[PDB]
Amino acid sequence: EHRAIMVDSMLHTVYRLSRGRSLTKAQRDVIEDCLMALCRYIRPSMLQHLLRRLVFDVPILNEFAKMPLKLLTNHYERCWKYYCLPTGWANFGVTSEEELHLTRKLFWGIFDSLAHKKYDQELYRMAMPCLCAIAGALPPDYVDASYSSKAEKNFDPRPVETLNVIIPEKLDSFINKFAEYTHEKWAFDKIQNNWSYGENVDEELKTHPMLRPYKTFSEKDKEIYRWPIKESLKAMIAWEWTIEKAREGEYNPQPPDLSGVTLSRELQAMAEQLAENYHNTWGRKKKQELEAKGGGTHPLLVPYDTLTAKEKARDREKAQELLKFLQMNGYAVTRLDTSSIEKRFAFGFLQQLLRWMDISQEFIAHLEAVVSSGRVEKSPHEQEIKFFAKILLPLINQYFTNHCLYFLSTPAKVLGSGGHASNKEKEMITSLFCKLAALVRHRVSLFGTDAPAVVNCLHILARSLDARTVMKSGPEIVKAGLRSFFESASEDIEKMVENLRQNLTYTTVALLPVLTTLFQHIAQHQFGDDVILDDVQVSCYRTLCSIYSLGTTKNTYVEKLRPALGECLARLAAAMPVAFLEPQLNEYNACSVYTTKSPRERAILGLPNSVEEMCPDIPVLDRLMADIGGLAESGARYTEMPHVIEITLPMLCSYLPRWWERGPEAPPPALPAGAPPPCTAVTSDHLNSLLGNILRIIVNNLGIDEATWMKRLAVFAQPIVSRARPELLHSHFIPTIGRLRKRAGKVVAEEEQLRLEAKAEAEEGELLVRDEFSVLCRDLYALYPLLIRYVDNNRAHWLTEPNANAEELFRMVGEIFIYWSKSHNFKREEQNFVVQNEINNMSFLTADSKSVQTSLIVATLKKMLPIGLNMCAPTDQDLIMLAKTRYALKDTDEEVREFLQNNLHLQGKVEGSPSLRWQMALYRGLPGREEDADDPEKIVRRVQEVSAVLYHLEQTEHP
């Protein structure tokens, strides 16, 4: 930064050398590699003129623009925080509004050039990341200097000659008056510069020495400076916007001519146009001389709308002082009311994508027509189709990924760092989502290569939607469109039901995942209260009824599709704001169609006026509680009852948790709020019974092999395990973890026999035991995640008051942990199962509250370690290290127990160690601690077990 001027000039010269005319390929490669490597390391603010040059020339999209736009996207991807974040990029400063408007002009120039120019693989492939990078880097909330700017298009300085243009005298009066006024104000600047305007030419003053008063000043020597001002005003009036005086008619002037003040926005925009005229018209001669010299584009002769604010001031000040002289005299330039949202980057590109959306709707309509009518490969909109598929879809994906927080930013609760999207932006982005859905409704057959791209992009548009503000106080057309799209999707699901007994492919791969993602988003943001109602609620009603019928029907294809139905229906239950499972108390809930709609509205909508008559297929929540309880008692496997676990368990595990907050047990915010009785009478008791049923069916299905949906069952039970009753531990987890422990012990005994034998049968038995406890690894990776959240809730309770059952559970999990630690085959088979079933990600989310390296067994053991560490006295902690050295000698448990019994007298002493005083005092202060635990047998038991746990822990951490 100390001498960055020559760094800037070096960048400019190196760019010219790369865009030389006589170079070899290797030499050009060296120059271009130097340019990218240099700009990667320099500060992004040093690109103030190289970036301007790129803005001017890259939209040509020539063969020479490869490295320019590649370096462009590399730099912007590097410094995406420099523009998008209003705080800047850490130590590096905040972006200038000039650079932001250069970014806007560059982005849209590249976009439009890519639009007119024909599809070519190289340019589209290598420029789409560039276009996404510029779009993401420029903040959406940014507003340009003027939406109605010049937007014009070695440069061609368009000479708008005005000496030939006649001027009406009614305004030519003040044209001449301002020529004289600028001469007088020039002299005023001279005298203000401590050099009074002289009358005879003299070098004593550096300023103008011959600015005589108008009486004694010769007319021609006035004109030497007066005629440029007249031609300035004449050009400004010669453009279609003519400056007109407000009041009819018309060596220092009385009013001060200052360019600091500003006129109306339109006047400022075409005063910027007047300064662009100062460039073009008044420097066509300069361009002639510059072309004679051969020096490239002169810094001022660069287009003015893209010129840096520091040097464009040379003509900006002149245009502004002209316009301000007009302003203080009231003169108005008669020749557009653009709102701030349209002025903004976001909604402007939103209108443009809506324009290309109707264009692409026409294109895909013509493509479907020519597909249906024989095989017409020739497409008049083939360039449009290729442009959309190769640029637009990844562009909207990336842009909505990097600005989804902005488009979801509620004005009440600001979520986006830059700001909140406008209501119009939110509503037509929702309409864009609906239009994409309607486009790909039956287009899924065509665009086969781009179909995954379509479904992921439409997932992104499904995310971050302010359905609240578009359905409530929003455009009627857009809200009716989304309501009709949900209604059509429900009818499509009914058609899917009929088919099980394109459209089928649509429901298979595009309709259902996007519908699930939309339900998930509405569930996370709890928008369903004002969104899933009226006809939307009716469509969700028929959807849930039809997918319940799908669960009832049993065929191979619906079996293979059941995970999708279960996930989709769990998400719609979590986003469904009326307790359809509580039909008797539906009047208490204010979200139902029956209370929201009038009786006449229900009659014209065909509503049954009751939830029971609405859906008698699904019985009441007590009935499905009884059903799942009976299935748990009977030990229903996946073979015996697949539909239950696949689909009906999501009912419970999604609707019941969220509606526990609406249940009576959850405290109402206020007495008037709780005055309406809860429509759902659920409490934590039915939740805990549902955990009991899930644990029972899991332990009954533990011996079943090739069970895969049980993993998603554990994922679905992840929220329900919270708010669990204390007795549930010894009711369910202790028995099933005991069964897991004994089965793992039998398997590890077989593995020990396998290790001691070394025959050819031992290798086959080695593969046999690998496959024999692969299912054990799967079962533990199912059950232990439920334990992880359970110990998370009850760790404080167990540490404040010790529970003997909790200590026994610690012994159980420690025994499983030492089984996993001793056997090398255990760890490698666990890792193999993880990489096979992609368990690393779900383990990461399981460890996350509210990985391949991460070992669930170790994590569970570390979380539960304090529970079984507090059972021993500090004087026993003074025996743990000698027991650890016993285990370091690789000795057996019997011998370590015996020589611990020998070291029964080698325990530490409270008066011996000062820290033992407070540790031993706290160990007494534990309410559940008595002196009966000091029995030597109990002491040696707990010392040996704790030391085994600690030694295997430290071996796992550091082998």
Next chain:
Amino acid sequence: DSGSETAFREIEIGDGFLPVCSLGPGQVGHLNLGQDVSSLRFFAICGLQEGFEPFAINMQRPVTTWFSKSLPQFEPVPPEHPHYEVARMDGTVDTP
């Protein structure tokens, strides 16, 4: 955000560390260093089994603290002040 339990890690021992709390306007905080481990709540839940020890566990007198007094008091200009420098020029002749 990444899920790591340790907030700050790889912290050099250096000169040492001290408990500290910066309260804002109209703010009330109870700093319990751990003179009374019984008064230290949640210590059994976190810290007791992890091996952590209360700060000033065996200290008899309470730990003195140092509040950031806001009274503007003159103090000498540091020789290595990043912005202001004081030069001690010699008197010489015709100059004090």
